[PDB]
Amino acid sequence: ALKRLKVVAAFQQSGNSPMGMVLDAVPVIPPELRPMVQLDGGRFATSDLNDLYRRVINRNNRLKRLIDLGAPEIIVNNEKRMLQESVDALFDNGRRGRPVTGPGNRPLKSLSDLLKGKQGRFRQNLLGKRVDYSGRSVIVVGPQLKLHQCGLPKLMALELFKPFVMKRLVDLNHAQNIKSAKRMVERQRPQVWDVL
Amino acid sequence: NSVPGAPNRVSFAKLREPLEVPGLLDVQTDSFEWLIGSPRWRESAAERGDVNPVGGLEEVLYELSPIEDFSGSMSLSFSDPRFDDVKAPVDECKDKDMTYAAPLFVTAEFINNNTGEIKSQTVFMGDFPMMTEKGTFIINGTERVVVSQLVRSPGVYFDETIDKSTDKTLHSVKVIPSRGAWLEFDVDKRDTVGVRIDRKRRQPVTVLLKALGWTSEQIVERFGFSEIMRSTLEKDNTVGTDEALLDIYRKLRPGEPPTKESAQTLLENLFFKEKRYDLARVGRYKVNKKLGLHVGEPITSSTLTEEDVVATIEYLVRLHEGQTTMTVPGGVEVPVETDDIDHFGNRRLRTVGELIQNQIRVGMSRMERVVRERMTTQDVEAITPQTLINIRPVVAAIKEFFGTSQLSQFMDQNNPLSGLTHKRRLSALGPGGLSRERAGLEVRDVHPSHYGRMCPIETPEGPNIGLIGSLSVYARVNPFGFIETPYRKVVDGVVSDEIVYLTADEEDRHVVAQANSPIDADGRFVEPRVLVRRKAGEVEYVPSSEVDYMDVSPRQMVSVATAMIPFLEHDDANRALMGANMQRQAVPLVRSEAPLVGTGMELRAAIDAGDVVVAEESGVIEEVSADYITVMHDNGTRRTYRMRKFARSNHGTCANQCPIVDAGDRVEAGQVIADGPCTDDGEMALGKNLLVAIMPWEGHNYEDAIILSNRLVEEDVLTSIHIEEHEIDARDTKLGAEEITRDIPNISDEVLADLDERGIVRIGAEVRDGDILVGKVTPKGETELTPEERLLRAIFGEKAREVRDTSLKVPHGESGKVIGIRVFSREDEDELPAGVNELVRVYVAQKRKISDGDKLAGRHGNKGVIGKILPVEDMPFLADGTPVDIILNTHGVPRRMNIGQILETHLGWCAHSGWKVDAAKGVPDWAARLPDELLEAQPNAIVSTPVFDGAQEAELQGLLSCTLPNRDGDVLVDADGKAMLFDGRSGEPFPYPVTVGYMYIMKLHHLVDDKIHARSTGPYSMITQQPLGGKAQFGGQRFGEMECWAMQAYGAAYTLQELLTIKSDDTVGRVKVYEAIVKGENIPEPGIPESFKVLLKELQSLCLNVEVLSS
Amino acid sequence: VLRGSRLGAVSYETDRNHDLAPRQIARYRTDNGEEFEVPFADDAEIPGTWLC
Amino acid sequence: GAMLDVNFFDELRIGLATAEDIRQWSYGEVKKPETINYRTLKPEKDGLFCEKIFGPTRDWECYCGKYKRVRFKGIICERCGVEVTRAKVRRERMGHIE
Amino acid sequence: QAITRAMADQARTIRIPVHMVEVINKLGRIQRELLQDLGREPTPEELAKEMDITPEKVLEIQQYAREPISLDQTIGDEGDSQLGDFIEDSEAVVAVDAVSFTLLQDQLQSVLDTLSEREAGVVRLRFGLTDGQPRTLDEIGQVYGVTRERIRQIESKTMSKLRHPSRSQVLRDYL
């Protein structure tokens, strides 16, 4: 009774009604969060949620056809059970039964897989990202330096500090405008190092 | 010796070798020609018995045939595979982007039983990819290596565990097949004997015995010795075979109503029939060997038997009772003991022929499914084998094995050692073996049954340590897949010259001596007691007549890359592991000299790797050029050998081949006729010999950094050639066809200067980062131009230019000379994919000097980047005036326990300067065991200290004390190996002597020009709008969780916020930051990152009502 | 390097707010009594039925 | 509360969406398992990538090209039903399956 | 019939109609028979002659018969990186084109501002530099009270003024 009263008191003390645990409509995520991109060479790549959504729509439309056709309850109940399993595979694939697989016996990636784990949203894209203005090389020892100094290779510094040097090339009248200043930085003219 | 023109490398070794090193690609070539059924394999198998052997393809076709439908009225069976000649040779296949293959023809045969009719054809089965002469496959133009897999063999595996509540020994069995259903037999904490048949719950074994059809009198008569079996017979409360079958059927297939015939045939059609259960020939062999069932009978009928099940339960109850021997009625006695699953007599090797055989078997199962399926539809007496057979699944199975599999890998081509060590690799992971994260710490260990079979040293140091290993030098592989190793048979204390190849079980049965125990010149042991290796990894001292085998050599336990480390037994095993793994990352240099002090392995590892051109038949060299050698044989005929000049390897390096024979020279068969990438006069040469000093020097070699001379940059000592290949193709679009042209949209005639009159660069032209290589243009269509752009077009008179420039340009940070262009076309009937009309490849080669940031190593695990390249004049120099070439730090040597590098430095100085032992008043006492004519050497002598039998420290002391002067009588390095140096800057002499000598260092493929990247703004991802990652893009660096915790610990709220919004995700803030930097203003305030909005839409689409509130 | 396009266009304009074309609002009603507003152009023929 | 997300948030509340919430977030019902045309590679009406539901693919154009500037901003084409606006609203509009 | 027509409608993500699925299956059977009875993969000319179509129609059908790959599959072997982390968004704002267009707008407004008032107004209303709507010469003529040919003549003379080096040197770099 204690373990039951946790969820009964949760539905009581709030303004929630427990009727929201059964679905009468299913929301559909916006298209560019599950895109269909056309690669180089005319090949297409798509996003594994279109297959799960298409299974839901196919079984729902066929159920509408059977109900308005007046089919027997064996056929209608088999269609309803299939519709239920397709919505379950959309929300959480492989939680109940065998996962729905794509080509090559690879299970499809459902809506709860976008959130969980080391490679989910929360840990891959929100708590740590990839950043602009950012380089990497291999360190060697700098025993002539002071403690507050580092040696930065000039070819890395020219790419990190590129807008600052474009602004300064325009300001010193080495370039007429930002387009020719960007061309000077890309072609590595001799004025670029004096500015850098 | 035994190689016809080898250079004279005098050896410090003291022991005679009874057995020569085998072919080091036998593990690949013998397996694949078993799979074919070659006449060479047929006679090699006929040597080891007349056992009527069958190849891998014939074995698959025999186990498949005959395919019969359900009525039994018709059958289709296969026979007699044959191969034609290969369609095109290996160089043509590599050049033209093809696959080196041969067509396979089998003989199919159809029988109509009701009438009697034999309709026999000859069916094309596909283009089977063939293995070249070096153990590789040319799959789609690239050279690939299939890696052998270490797996657990099928069989019976008894083991025990100790309980921790009752402290009882709980024994168990698992019998595991290839392709079947499992069954176990536990003995639990109560006195019961269980069965988990096919991973079900549990039941007593008397249920299974009664279901097989045993009465309780039969069970009591058999297991009359066991109180466990009597108790579990009494406590089962189920009597009768039909009742037991009902009890099994009620849980084996739950939900199906128990019918009598289905219940009676469930057990037989689950285990005892060849459809759904066949432990293989190896599994049947191991079951018969463990339980002692059939001793000399040929292995056939590889399903399980009721005698096997009863023998397993009898073995289990006798093992729990505590006996040590048993006999089943009708067999031989066997010891009763538990099994180790990591033991190399239980771990087999699925080699290249067996992995390809499994994929052929998988494809032919789908083929015979379609055979039955279209055998039922079509009208009988109108059908024929070419109407029944669909070979497309077999073709696709072999194709998707050779491309996109884990064990079909891109061949490691840095040097010949990388290539030779990629073959002879035993990887424990892959499809059918264990994972990397789910693998325990017990399978990553070195076991005493790896002696002579797997190398304990050479393994990766990453997260694969122990799961990938290498074959030892002398090891063989069984017909069944077990690794053998050779031993010398000793009888009555006399070591004979019989060589017996023992697998790990027979080695456990005998007692095996050591290869350096003394011998009284006929074979008889000198000492009274000999050090041996006993059954469980025990090392004892037994009497000299207790011994019955002996190792053929020291270094029997090591692999090829480990047997090239001189003074290995003075290095710790961590540093030896690093040295062996860095030896196959060295790059080919432009000149490539051979080491002064080496082992003897460098010649055979260079001939066996295959980058050396070897004269196939003796003759006389008729004409040499840089492109070919033509030798005229002893009977009229000649043969020309083309060289591979300046060819790109799989990893970017160069693959030059240089002749080393003169124009009238007589060559012998097997003599090296042309060099290779990393060889000098035929032997493997991965580095250079440099003069070293072992001092610290002003902090520039602090913590593994390295100081180099500028002589190594001026004289091109450590300089290498790297080739890059860039590819574009011009295919059909929806709006038209792309074309390759000089008439590109609006770019100047400055940047169209090196392009010939079809839009490709000229050969020989220097290219910089951003230069046009192939000028391509695509049809664009119609778009709406801005009013500003339309006004500019109206001012300057330019047109719309309905095509869009997408050329191929040199990427960032690259340059070189264009050295080769390879253009394929659709109209010239080249085989291009569908859509592609033209394909162009450009080769850009550049020559790289050594620069700081580059990584060097020696053979003893001593790596380090270059920190400084000093001038020649400020380098420590000898009293001769000779500068040193490399300075290595002292503090890195003794805490790493790799003084093999110091003893190598000492021997290298003695081999550079030469020596002479003064045998005037007799040979000195330290040189009593020195081989003769190691008693003097000339300057720059090449010497060889083998691995566990080499130069001792007494011999290095003596050779340091006698060594030749330079040009004046000036012995520069004293009897300790230490020299007096001068400072190149101050001029004063350094106050104490410094260790100098010649160490053989090599340059590793971890260069700075590949490692450096930077980014200000570049490509962004698609769903979340964060930067892409990688040097191949522009690519951002990752700022993860641990970096965020460091920023929060500092307190840097503004730095952290700017990194996580307007440098990743804030799509409207990125552009305003750029505009504000360029206009010189203040950086604006951040906004909501786009990943948070993507998170909110995914939470909403999981039916959760997430909403942001105001106050 | 893979490079793909979700097949759409991005225009470079200043999003203004003042000089915009006139619009008229229709109102539709479905068979369960719901009501919706659709902004059509002023110089355009309002359809009889609309999928809401 | 806020929906455009200008960064004055006080709270983020989670709850359990009912069917009225779902069909109030939605911009239209998707009722075909179609994605794009196989020939013209443009989205299909009522499909999973529909422009009448999810917004236009090109900045400030309708589907039939009848309205094509920022002068027509915020109106709905009377032929195809596509509201002429930005193309980045296809990351923000949801639909539903009944 | 119901099973086969449903499979044609519902097998693929990008839906090919039933008649095109029928010619794709026909080409597949033809190609299998020729590969079996020829010992070699047949050419498009041999396929197009066996199936009575043109050799470009064979390639159109063979390129309509291609199924999409998945954005969510692991393209690595050990790094656990998907495919979608390798595809550059080729339609994002490039952040230097967007500021170059801004500075082009400012510079073009300056060069037009150093002309006369009506001469600059003619070019701005002609090219729609103020509201994105390029008007015609008669509209600008009734705006300024002038006729169409005089509007065209002063437009030609302002183009002659703007084609000068002293005006166009500051704008040559923006193409």
Ligand SMILES: [Zn+2]
């Ligand atoms: Zn429209």
